[PDB]
């Protein structure tokens, strides 16, 4: 930096070092809080696909999954039977 | 609108287009065959070639709309008739000029 | 929605609340148009405060047009705004919203007094001169008077013809599959 | 709208799932309940929630002490040899 | 007279004591920010019931 | 320390908070509005990259154009302030007392209230 | 406009302590839209292979 | 979004459907062979136990304190004007002490937090010990809220606004009966849904449904009054 | 791309024709005063360089082209589907909304023409702005995606800002006391400031909502959004209630700031104070018949799949607005304030009706 | 018998004759007339122009004179040259609108929406269950404005 000393005399490191440190500490604490506690809680992956889920949300999700699977299976079976009946009746 | 078949059919891919002439020709042929069969429930397997042509030519949404319209038409045909509807509409329009006074001291219920 | 041996019966028209909302919007627009036409017929610079409602104390047509427009905005029964408010309350009852009916009624009565209080200011010691002068004489616009008269007729007798407007609005809304 | 293009002018990776979901929605009379599989596949290809859950589980397992040494990969023969066996390409040798 | 009319009149007057007749830019922006933040806060409070 | 998605989602609203917080000087608010538009630009680019969405990527130039038009309007309004005799510091356009201002003091344009 | 650079004499501490610090604290506590995005170094880079 | 979901649950319907029930114990049962640390840590299910009067009272107190702190953050502190000398002294404290902002926040929010906690705890105890087993739920909610908010407005705000407090309490009680103790926008059942019990044949069920439809026909005014044209 | 079907752009021809005619005539009127007199030309009368043209002809042109558009709508035929890359929807309800907006604009233009014939205090630029607003505002109901809706509403907002800019400022009144004294009126600046910043807030919040809707669902089309939300509710796959609630809150708050509903109303009061009566006459029509109607349709038709979140937000907003205005509406002392608060009260009532409908 | 011949100068009046008050048909509903070209491009639509479209243009030209004068009657402080230019602009706009209407009529004839001279081999006939207008139209002038199978 040409005339680096004259340029950096006023603000070598920071204008308000205390405030800069408070900003850094707040950022660090908030990132720690979010990543460690808050986002994991919202994600709710601790008991994901657990055979015996102790969390109401996970139990509801598994209930939805099994109910959808049962609905799809039943409708597929019924549609297959209906198509077979229609094909049989066609050749009469 | 998530439950609306009409809007879900109105949805389409960015590059999708419908060949209405060909689809309607195939559908007319298939429905003529179905009418010739003249069964209570439309059994498409009784018209294999025309059914395949109709499926190839027409889109799923168009086919769904056509089947629903056919069901409604079948129900209307089973229920009413042209002369009956004409007479009923004429009678109702004639009645509309008069008033519907309450029936006091009824006997039923 | 009722089920009898897999036969669905629907005695409710889903595309009715939208029709009622459209009716309310149209009624408010009509009444706003009436009041604004009354204002535009006169000189605009006079009306700058609620006290200046006395400036409407002009010949009978303008005076009573303003009075009835204010009453219609308030929601007095015979006038047009009552149709919209009553139909909104009827639809709320149909949907079984007693708390919504309560809050609607609170807002309606507060707004009713808000509109009505200006009738007190409408009283003037003498007759105002709010008409623009053209060719040394006040300029009265026959076209705007005719439009105000049509709006007044509809404001007075909207209840009689409301069935046709309701039919048209329900017909328009039925195209929406909701 | 779903343009269906990639970031280099190609095809969006979710285009097949989107087409399947739209076809099912159009065909079915009860699309919400009869297109659950296709819609879930499309949502998975879009969001990747299941893979994130799998990664979370794998991270927890790795944190747990169960794995010591994975088998080496003999690339010449496209085979896997146990880490115990010594090979010329082995790092420790 | 009082418990039916003066009550509401005094309520309105006392509320208007705390309302600025003329809007200012600081109040406009602060009200917008307060709505944005606290509607979200109250909705999340309803969602969670911490 | 923070994932990019969360970082940008938070900093957009933080920028809005700064815009509201800073003293209401039209030029400063205009600069903060430009910064908010650029934050939206960056967030849209991030989401477009994540989801392979050419629409999200293309939102960039739309945001740039909208921001440019709004900035032109802001320049025009700031210049119009002079002809309309309004201080850029909007807080000085009203007589309401404000402890946030060290030297806010207005008097009626008179020399003596009592003559006799 | 404002060539000399002189600005309004404004004290931000009053508003910072009255309205902004607690509101920001609450917003930070209750605000997170990122659902399941994972930081780099969450898993070893050697597991990723698609690139 | 649901308010008070647990209380307004159809246990029979969820049981017949197989839907998970919010009334499950939700408890931890550490094994007798588990570690001492595991046994100690398994006690956290007490913090989930809902039949705990003191836990519930502290829960309500925390809710009230949070609400009061939010009110102070949003409207109360900004509306209240602090003396210039006091502001200067507290700013000097911030300058002369690290993290002075935290202590200033504590001092400013202590009144609101404390009053909110007290209001929440007292309200929970009031509603639970009294009005919990009344016959008319709507009337009980209205009267309880009216009295509580009347007293609260008389004490916290001003004794001269107790009538407005009572009116606001009546309104809040009606709102709470509408959207807290009742499920208007939180429906978890289809309208008209039911369950079948007993060994009735499908033919018998269809015959009964036909009879029900015949009865339902009488609802229509035209058929009941015999005012239909011959179609 | 091999074949460009006429079905993709048939509907754009009338609007483009109207735009061309409007702008060509506007440029001709702008350059109207230029008429060279050749040295061999003879003037029957001395030219009157001072001219103040009445905009009655502009208003009549607007009425004529609106009537032609009405004729096009009446004679319109086609299939119910989307055109031009699924960005615009073409169905009976949307076309009826377009026709209703056009009819109301035509009637209001007729009344405005009569008023202008009565007295002229408005320039040709004012009615050119009105022409642009009338041409571009009914196209909103043809929006098929939130992206195109945002762009159309931004264009309409720019047109309305143009209309406010071209408001008359100084009048030749009968007050002869202020000839040599400075009188300060801040109404113009207040209107411009509040409109500009409300537009900024609404635009940024709507863009944020659009970005997050794209993140949640691959597209931003109404039908796809609703289908994906309903299927997500069925499957329980995506269950970030915080994200869904925040998206809904951002959308609702953006529209609240845009419209000027009870929580944020004071800027609307200031704008009404600073606007002329004719400007209010047109703005109330535009607002109620388009902006508020689309706001209602967001909960009724477009984003109906998200009503499980919208209901609580709407209820809270309505309650707060009612309890906030109950006392304010009795503190005003201005005609413009009275009109604005009438609009606000009607908006609150319609919001309550919308809640009842979405129930 | 109910609609003017599509090849005549009055064939453009069929735009006002509609079976139902709807704007557009449903996605799947067959057009009233056989489809000539569903995927019609600009060039083919122009090639499909007809005496009906020419008559529509002529109607636009004839009706643009009174309308242009009506628009001009609200003009003041205008020179003769500017007045004539404004009249020319308005008349040209009306004629361009007529051209657009003719283009739309050609598109409709191609798609089968309006009478294109062809008829489906088998008509899909409705059942007039709801009839509030048959007798009214028969006894009134509006029977001309509606098309009935
Ligand atoms: C229950 C609640 C109900 C609420 C109702 C709300 C509305 C009420 C008030 C307004 C109603 C409309 C009034 C007519 C328009 C105003 C202008 C006018 O005609 O008077 C000036 C003109 C004055 O002439 P003048 O004094 O000799 O000379 C004037 C100037 O010197 C020289 O004049 P000029 O040269 O400058 O201009 C002459 C030209 C001036 O005319 C105009 O420019 C008209 C301006 C308005 C245009 C919009 C009209 C829309 C009509 C449709 C319905 C909606 C109405 C919305 C109204 C409010 C919108 C803000 O005159 C005309 O040609 C007038 C024709 C009017 C009929 C227009 C019909 C258009 C129909 C289009 C839609 C068709 C349906 C399509 C379906 C699509 C399906 C796919 O009046 C007359 O010539 C007759 C006056 C006396 C009779 C008036 C009869 C009015 C009947 C109204 C029926 C309303 C619908 C039915 C009832 C619905 C509820 C049950
Ligand atoms: C991520 C975004 C933010 C990043 C950081 C900021 C940078 C970007 C700024 C732009 C964004 C908007 C900023 C607007 C500022 C408004 C005005 C203002 O305050 O600034 C002017 C203020 C004065 O400026 P100045 O006049 O130039 O400077 C004069 C002095 O030099 C100044 O020095 P000073 O010492 O006087 O000032 C220190 C300043 C900054 O504060 C600090 O010194 C650092 C604070 C670090 C947080 C410590 C709390 C514990 C963290 C735990 C984390 C891990 C938890 C894990 C959970 C696991 C569970 C399983 O203190 C405060 O702001 C006071 C509040 C700080 C405490 C926050 C407490 C939150 C939790 C409370 C929950 C409820 C407790 C109930 C009672 C419990 C009793 C047992 O400027 C600064 O000092 C620099 C800016 C700092 C902004 C801080 C904003 C507050 C957020 C703090 C972190 C929140 C963490 C939440 C998650 C964890 C919860 C446990
Ligand atoms: C209003 C009811 C709801 C209140 C909610 C808030 C509760 C706070 C927490 C509990 C406080 C415990 C009691 C301590 C005193 C508190 C009060 C106090 O200090 O105030 C200052 C002053 C007493 O302080 P002091 O003069 O310095 O000396 C006090 C001695 O130190 C006194 O000390 P001492 O050594 O003489 O001993 C006093 C002994 C005396 O024990 C008793 O006698 C208490 C049991 C009997 C009372 C039961 C309640 C009333 C039931 C009847 C309800 C009737 C309603 C009918 C409605 C009809 C419909 C309109 O109490 C104790 O020391 C036992 C303490 C044991 C621990 C309690 C654990 C509490 C945990 C929660 C703490 C909360 C912290 C946050 C609080 C702040 C934020 C909200 O008291 C008052 O000003 C109270 C004024 C009461 C009204 C005026 C009374 C005369 C005129 C008659 C009016 C009739 C109106 C009837 C209703 C409306 C009809 C239209
Ligand atoms: C590329 C260009 C190179 C050439 C540039 C020119 C070089 C020569 C001049 C450089 C300095 C500028 C002139 C200063 C003149 C005034 C001297 C003075 O007052 O003191 C200066 C400064 C004084 O700073 P200060 O504290 O007064 O800063 C506040 C300034 N005011 C008062 C205006 C608000 O000395 C120091 O700060 C020294 C101690 C802190 C140094 C920085 C520590 C943190 C950053 C480095 C970390 C390194 C790694 C260790 C950390 C952990 C890592 C894992
Ligand atoms: C929009 C609708 C508005 C509704 C307005 C509601 C009115 C609110 C009035 C609030 C009054 C103040 C709070 C009262 C709290 C006590 C209520 C109570 O005990 O009733 C519960 C019990 C609980 O009832 P329950 O629930 O077991 O049985 C209800 C029975 N049926 C179904 C028939 C309704 O109710 C009653 O026995 C009284 C019911 C009527 C309310 C009577 C209020 C009396 C108030 C004066 C009391 C005076 C006491 C003595 C002192 C006299 C002066 C010296
Ligand atoms: C069996 C054989 C049948 C053969 C039929 C052959 C004829 C077919 C065409 C018939 C046309 C009938 C008249 C149409 C309207 C004429 C309007 C006119 O000239 O008024 C000038 C007038 C101009 O004014 P003016 O000429 O009345 O005088 C103005 C005088 N001052 C100013 C003093 C008051 O137009 C207007 O005022 C309209 C202004 C608004 C714009 C309205 C546009 C309407 C467009 C209509 C297009 C045509 C629709 C045809 C529908 C047919 C349905 C079957
Ligand atoms: C809210 C804002 C308003 C509404 C929304 C705005 C919508 C914006 C999007 C509009 C998209 C329109 C795309 C149309 C593309 C097709 C055009 C077309 O029909 O072309 C058919 C024809 C092609 O017809 P074709 O497609 O049948 O040809 C191919 C035929 N086969 C396949 C058989 C070989 O196009 C051309 O030949 C010309 C192409 C364009 C050439 C360049 C024109 C530039 C014009 C610049 C402006 C000039 C102004 C002059 C003014 C004079 C007076 C002052
Ligand atoms: C080329 C293609 C086209 C693109 C062209 C791009 C053009 C870019 C133009 C850049 C202009 C730079 C010069 C002007 C800005 C200089 C910085 C400045 O003004 O600082 C303001 C602000 C902090 O200000 P304050 O808190 O008062 O303290 C100042 C401390 N420097 O500053 C901040 O906010 C933060 C400043 C951080 C400074 C960091 C200094 C690092 C020094 C490193 C020394 C060498 C060792 C490097 C080791 C790296 C290890 C990984
Ligand atoms: C919520 C939606 C609806 C909104 C509209 C309003 C709804 C009101 C519902 C309740 C109405 C109760 C009747 C009285 C209301 C007004 C209050 C009142 O009369 O009591 C006040 C009086 C104390 O007066 P004081 O404090 O000196 O003066 C006020 C100082 N600021 O006395 C007190 O100290 C209060 C004592 C308790 C109140 C007892 C009231 C008993 C009334 C019995 C007869 C009338 C019954 C009418 C209703 C019948 C049922 C419908």
TrEMBL record, chain B:
Source superkingdom:
Eukaryota
Q: List the disulfide bonds.
A: 23-58, 33-47
What is the designated name of this protein? Uncharacterized protein
Q: What is the lineage of its organism?
A: Eukaryota, Sar, Alveolata, Ciliophora, Intramacronucleata
Q: Which residues of the full protein are shown?
A: 36 to 144 of 144
Automatic annotation (TrEMBL), chain H:
Q: Does the keyword Metal-binding apply?
A: yes
> Which keywords does this Swiss-Prot/TrEMBL entry list?
Membrane, Metal-binding, Transmembrane, Transmembrane helix, Zinc
**Residues at which Zn(2+) binds:** 12
Annotated transmembrane regions: 65-87, 108-126, 146-172
Protein's name in the database? Transmembrane protein, putative
From TrEMBL, chain I:
Q: Where exactly are the transmembrane stretches of this chain?
A: 5-27, 57-75, 95-112, 124-141, 147-166, 187-215, 235-257, 277-303, 309-330, 337-358
Every copy of the NADH:quinone oxidoreductase/Mrp antiporter transmembrane domain together lies at 194-356
Lineage, top-rank taxon, reads: Eukaryota
Keyword Transmembrane helix listed: yes
Keyword terms of this UniProt record: Membrane, Mitochondrion, Transmembrane, Transmembrane helix
Fetch the Pfam families from UniProt. Proton_antipo_M
Specify whether Magnesium is a keyword of the entry.
no
What protein does this entry describe?
A: Ymf65
The encoding gene is ymf65
UniProtKB/TrEMBL annotation, chain J:
Q: Which UniProt keywords apply?
A: Membrane, Transmembrane, Transmembrane helix
Q: Which InterPro entries is this protein grouped with?
A: NADH-UbQ_OxRdtase_su21_N
Q: Which residues cross the membrane?
A: 54-72, 84-103
Report domain NADH-ubiquinone oxidoreductase 21kDa subunit N-terminal positions.
31-114
The name of this protein is: NADH-ubiquinone oxidoreductase complex I, 21 kDa subunit
